[PDB]
């Protein structure tokens, strides 16, 4: 049973992460945030939550939405780092895998800044704290995929995922890295994560893969360099779209073909027939993360909390934008499930 051996190594971790989940903003707290009309009022209301005095070091006039997002995300990062410092064994590997996606983000960010001739220090300061590795600053030396792989990426945990650069090439490399990483993380969950967390993490990683596959299928239509053979190299092989709808999207050239492929799955129909595609994926991710919190002895709670806080920072940043820019008609367009 799940609770029999879980608490030997993860009882404290899971209790702390569930306290973090209790810290997620409820619907009433989001409504109170929405009622704010100034960013100082937003800071005041947000101090009545578990964010607390995270903006106390920021003066009233210096307060910007970018600062609010940066400090909320920093709080997220410190909480994740504390939870990972208490982890050992398979839980430590699980949270390292969680960091591997941010590692891929940092690699793509470094290469994007390098080909754009941005300041090296600025790119390093903008790198995600999660997903940092020691040889990350060395990625500025070259604009060649082979040169960076031999120079840096062969020693990183992203080395298994790689089996001059421009914006489209960096995009392709990043999406290939994501496909390989999602497949590897799915395999790791299948083989090394106990059953309730195994099923929850398989569902969550499959949803993430499906979101990426549908995005790639829909965004390759407006491009000509994305060959149908290249689309196969970008679509992950772990989701509910795999392998049927994944194969259908890897060959589609029109929006109707993509929509017909997505009518295959009962989980994602209506995503393309109404609303915004990204709103559907955000709502589904928050629904899945909310359901993952119904499992008590699952380490998938860490991933669910991480995604819920990322969505929470997105929501708070959107509310900050609909406070700063006026635009109070769109202030309620945030995903909330807690």
């Amino acid at each position: 049973m799940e609770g029999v051996y879980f608490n030997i190594d993860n009882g404290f971790i899971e209790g702390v992460v569930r306290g973090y989940r209790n810290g997620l903003l409820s619907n009433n707290q989001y409504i109170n945030l929405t009622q704010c009309d100034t960013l100082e009022d937003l800071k005041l209301q947000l101090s009545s939550t578990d964010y607390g005095n995270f903006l106390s070091s920021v003066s009233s006039e210096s307060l910007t939405t970018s600062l609010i997002q940066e400090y909320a995300s920093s709080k997220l990062y410190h909480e994740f780092n504390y939870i990972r410092d208490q982890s050992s064994g398979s839980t430590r590997k699980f949270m390292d895998y969680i960091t591997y996606g941010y590692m891929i983000d940092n690699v793509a960010l470094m290469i994007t800044g390098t080909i754009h001739d941005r300041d090296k220090g600025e790119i390093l300061q903008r790198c995600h704290p999660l997903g940092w590795f020691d040889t990350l600053p060395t990625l500025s030396v070259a604009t060649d995929l082979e040169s960076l792989y031999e120079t840096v990426l062969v020693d990183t945990p992203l080395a298994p995922y790689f089996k001059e650069l421009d914006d489209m090439n960096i995009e392709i490399i990043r999406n290939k890295l994501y496909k390989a990483y999602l497949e590897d993380f799915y395999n790791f969950v299948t083989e090394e994560i106990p059953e309730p967390a195994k099923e929850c993490m398989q569902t969550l990683l499959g949803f993430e893969a499906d979101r990426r596959s549908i995005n790639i299928a829909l965004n390759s239509l407006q491009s000509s360099d994305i060959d149908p053979d290249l689309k196969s190299d970008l679509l992950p092989n772990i989701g509910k779209l795999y392998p049927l709808a994944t194969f259908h999207l890897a060959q589609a050239q029109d929006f109707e073909g993509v929509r017909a492929a997505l009518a295959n799955v009962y989980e994602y129909r209506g995503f393309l027939e109404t609303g915004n595609l990204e709103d559907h994926f955000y709502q589904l991710e928050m629904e899945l993360c909310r359901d993952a919190f119904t499992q008590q002895f699952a380490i998938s709670t860490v991933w669910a909390w991480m995604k819920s806080k990322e969505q929470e920072v997105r929501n708070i940043t959107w509310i900050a934008e609909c406070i700063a820019q006026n635009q109070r008609e769109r202030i309620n367009n945030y995903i909330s499930v807690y």
Binding site: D167, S220, Q325
Partner: protein
């Protein structure tokens, strides 16, 4: 003199162009913010300085000519380089549709910028006449 009537007409057109420019910038800013929302494909959670290509030569240049005492400034679509700026931000696979909407709003701001500059210069020249 009828020069004051033309000053009033120019002020009216200046007001209308300010209103259009402000609406365009508001749309672009809110859609850029809504692109910061929907940042799951972004490199760092934001569509901004992370993507700025400091080697980017734009798709637009300005043209300045003079007729009589009036000076006209126009922005034209000249001066693979000079690419679609959406590609600066991973615009092929890694941008939301809201970022494209924001780009549309700002690209609409550009003609309004040119018209506003021309109206401002025309008003200043007419005022110098009076």
């Amino acid at each position: 003199d009828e020069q004051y009537l033309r000053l009033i007409e120019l002020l009216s057109n200046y007001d209308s162009t300010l209103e259009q420019l402000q609406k365009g910038f508001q749309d672009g800013y809110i859609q850029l913010s809504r692109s910061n929302y929907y940042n799951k494909d972004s490199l760092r959670g934001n569509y901004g300085e992370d993507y700025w290509d400091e080697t980017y030569i734009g798709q637009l240049m300005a043209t300045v000519e003079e007729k009589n005492s009036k000076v006209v400034v126009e922005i034209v679509k000249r001066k693979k380089q000079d690419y679609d700026p959406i590609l600066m931000f991973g615009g092929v696979l890694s941008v939301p549709s809201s970022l494209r909407q924001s780009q549309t709003s700002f690209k609409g701001c550009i003609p309004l910028i040119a018209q506003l500059i021309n109206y401002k210069n025309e008003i200043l020249t007419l005022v110098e006449t009076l």
